[PDB]
Write an enzyme that holds these catalytic residues in place. Structure first.
Site, mmCIF file in Angstrom:
data_model
loop_
_atom_site.group_PDB
_atom_site.id
_atom_site.type_symbol
_atom_site.label_atom_id
_atom_site.label_comp_id
_atom_site.label_asym_id
_atom_site.label_seq_id
_atom_site.Cartn_x
_atom_site.Cartn_y
_atom_site.Cartn_z
ATOM 1 C CB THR A 1 27.098 26.618 36.582
ATOM 2 O OG1 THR A 1 26.305 27.788 36.385
ATOM 3 C CG2 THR A 1 28.536 27.017 36.569
ATOM 4 C CG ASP B 1 30.127 40.367 43.638
ATOM 5 O OD1 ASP B 1 31.124 40.559 42.883
ATOM 6 O OD2 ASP B 1 29.541 41.303 44.244
ATOM 7 C CB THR C 1 23.417 43.932 39.745
ATOM 8 O OG1 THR C 1 23.438 43.562 41.131
ATOM 9 C CG2 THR C 1 22.287 43.169 39.019
ATOM 10 C CG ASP D 1 48.736 46.196 49.270
ATOM 11 O OD1 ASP D 1 48.216 45.066 49.506
ATOM 12 O OD2 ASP D 1 48.334 47.246 49.808
ATOM 13 N N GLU E 1 27.988 33.418 49.926
ATOM 14 C CA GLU E 1 27.408 32.630 51.012
ATOM 15 C C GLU E 1 28.499 31.813 51.722
#
Ligand SMILES: [Mg+2]
Ligand SMILES: [Mg+2]
Ligand SMILES: [Mg+2]
Ligand SMILES: [Mg+2]
Lengths: 272, 287, 278, 273
Positions: A44, A70, A96, A198, A248
């Protein structure tokens, strides 16, 4: 000889990881290159690239591996979720926090994370959808580095809320969570008995009267607060409130939240 | 800016001291670090490298081949006939690796990989013999574990006794040469059998090929010539050496030709020099 | 169902004896109706058809070329050297269209297109001369006509130089003084049936045909008669042709080929759409 | 000097008023003449147009769809969620073809094809309801002739339901018989019964109807001048209600509807629009 993945894409966020790109690539690429005889590696350059790469390669590839935190994982989520054809997704944790990698039992050692992928253990994973925004980990109001949820948990106002869940209705609240993932802020979910596969989402509200009870609940760190499971959820506040999620986003209440059962297939660790 | 937006790395898994994982640990990370769009394909069978080159020639700006002389030859035969030919680079994964040496590529595979990231590129001549392309050489009269065809021939030329003679007719740039021979070479590359070419003053980028013949009578003269290590034109009855662009080689009976790798080429042969037909990664610190 | 999952149509816009739009109205709809994955590329410059064949060879199952002998030759040179070679079809868009005629393709371009949708396919031999491939012919002594090299030669033969030739064919030798030396693969030359007798494009062998220095008048009368029956003529697989001095060779299209020549046959090297009714 | 180096034509073979060959004779040659890199893909099943759009979105500069409202909707849903969205054009191949009419596209398919070769392009708004995208409309309370077409044909000969509409920080609560949110300028093959709707004005038209008889007369006597314009809309009903939109969909209330300004670029007819 019998691999599940004829063609593999590795999306690399060069800013991800501890430091040297070279060092990180020395740890993660060779095992992947050894195992997968058709491997494409794309770096990227800007915010949005991972999303674009996922969208371009979704129909050309059988496995997409993302090396990033994330935010990068969330770009991949948003890239693949809306598509008709969605290859299997794997995470090498390069931030992290790495919440969803932990849900999948992925070792935080990136070399081991890579090695895991070569074992090809795959399971269905639920993906949530809030007003057309998809998420893997969580949706939340009242949370507002370690990340939004991580910071909130490290450092842990009223508003009225109306929640319509699968034909049932529900007060004055301080925190409203809808959880999909099994880890939040780098540790097991403070929402009890959440499962990512689930077919259902976990609503979790800390009431106006329950501020102290919730503080103690997080401290003792042993779970089993209004908590319910639901598939189809509508969340309303008195005034428009900004919603926090995996990365974001411009999402705000009111919200129709909906669960897509087994929407992704993902590499996981059955030993954990 | 980089010269290479998209890169393909063709890996022969059998190449190298053989250990894939170790080899890939040495060669991939520098490439992956330098080139943000890198595609890695393993070969499975003979011919795959040729197929991959042909499929990707128009999709990619650089093709890197990790393999020995045979795999490099597959790439040569893959790209040479095409209208669009991306730059080619060699990571030496055999024991001989003649053309890699011509380009000054270090035999240390990690260092070969690192070199590629410096993006030094030059034109290289490619010869064409009856529609077979080659980078190193074409030869007759070269024919238990292999240093390669030329390497083995040079190692045993001294103690091999009774070589067979054959007649040869060579047409070179409107001139003719006809004689009884033991060895006929047409050289393009600057290294043969892992050491500098025994053919004198061969250059891979000078727009011309080197014809080199040992007469039937010149067996001893040639043995001494190699020992002397004085690669110059001995004004020598027994050894004929000339430069040419367009060459035709005829024998009395069809003879099997030896070249960079496995091939079905045989005389008679039209050999043709294609000037700067490839662009290739090289080492300007050495060449 | 179909032999061809993916199809490429290469259009030379300058081809045809009518504008582009009219030509496309005749050839595209039948192809588009029959083939649910159809890619149409126009050529812009000399070489484009070659490039398009080389790029798409591995991505496509059928390549259709709409153009004359020159465009067909670009496709021949594009596919012939490749390891993977899809089926080739011709919609005749020049005036000569020799190899389309060999395959029995109607010169009516709408009908040529319709034929392709019937998917009748056969192996076709491709010749290789010193690494140059050809479909129709190789020749010496053929020395503003858009009729083509052979067409112009035949139109003006009515009203030549001799040269010695040595031909080695399948372990036999032929030396003599000659005026014309042909090696034929295709069944039509210059827009009419081959003047070389009993040539077949799929029989695994090539036809050598030499007109001696003594036979100039006999050959002129032979062409006038248009009888074309069994001049030295023999069939051979592996051929070597030598002249006293380097002679420029003529072939299907523009080329830099010259003697001496090793000519070789690649049996069933292409598969091509043909007309079994003809 | 073309805007479109590479073009994709998606053909629904079942589309059009006569034989496929005939339809292709009308639409392909002008496109093939104008565009030297043209790829033609037939659909075989429901969902194929969506898949083709998603596969080719990053490979192509123009996507032309030959089909009715349902095929156009597949394209809408295919491209709308993507980061990279080439220009879209419609050759009308159904009977209704609402959005093609919004763009001024002639219903003569040969002329629709010719229009595309002129390359007049404008931004078009795309609406988004709970992650479902639409070009024409969203509605509750609505052979076929299509959902709106059938409704209008049989309106001569209903249920009420409560609705809560939140529009740009304003609220509207009432008992209703029909609730529409319109984006397109044509509905059911004729100009929108919602007044002064524009597909490129950055805003959507809410339209709600005690008013059964008034509405019947309104459709009969087509004057066309509760109705409000809004960008960000939330629609709530007492119980979950099935929503109708451009084509087959599983959408239901409650709904967050959002306008994406100039989300698509599309071929249009400036002689008419
Ligand atoms: Mg759950
Ligand atoms: Mg040289
Ligand atoms: Mg024959
Ligand atoms: Mg509007």
């Amino acid at each position: 000889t019998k691999t599940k993945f004829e063609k593999v894409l590795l999306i690399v966020n060069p800013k991800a990881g501890q430091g040297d790109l070279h060092t990180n690539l020395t740890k993660i690429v060779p095992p992947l290159a050894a195992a997968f005889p058709d491997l494409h590696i794309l770096h990227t350059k800007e915010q949005g690239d991972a999303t674009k790469y996922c969208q371009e390669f979704a129909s050309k590839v059988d496995l997409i591996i993302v090396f990033g935190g994330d935010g990068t994982v969330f770009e991949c989520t948003n890239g693949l979720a809306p598509l008709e054809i969605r290859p299997t997704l794997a995470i090498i944790p390069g931030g992290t926090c790495n919440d969803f990698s932990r849900t999948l039992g992925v070792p935080q050692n990136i070399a081991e994370a890579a090695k895991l992928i070569t074992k090809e253990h795959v399971k269905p994973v639920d993906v949530a959808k809030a007003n057309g925004q998809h998420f893997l980990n969580f949706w939340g109001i009242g949370l507002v580095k370690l990340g939004k949820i991580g910071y909130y948990l490290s450092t842990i106002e009223t508003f009225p809320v109306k929640i319509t869940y699968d034909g049932q209705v529900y007060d004055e609240a301080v925190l409203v969570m809808v959880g999909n993932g099994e880890y939040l802020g780098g540790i097991p979910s403070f929402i009890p008995n959440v499962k990512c596969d689930d077919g259902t989402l976990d609503i979790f509200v800390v009431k106006s009267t329950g501020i102290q009870a919730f503080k103690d609940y997080i401290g003792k760190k042993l779970f089993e607060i209004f908590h319910v499971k639901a598939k189809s959820i509508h969340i309303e506040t008195e005034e428009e409130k900004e919603v926090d999620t995996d990365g974001e986003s411009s999402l705000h209440t009111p919200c129709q939240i909906e669960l897509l059962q087994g929407h992704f297939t993902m590499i996981y660790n059955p030993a954990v």
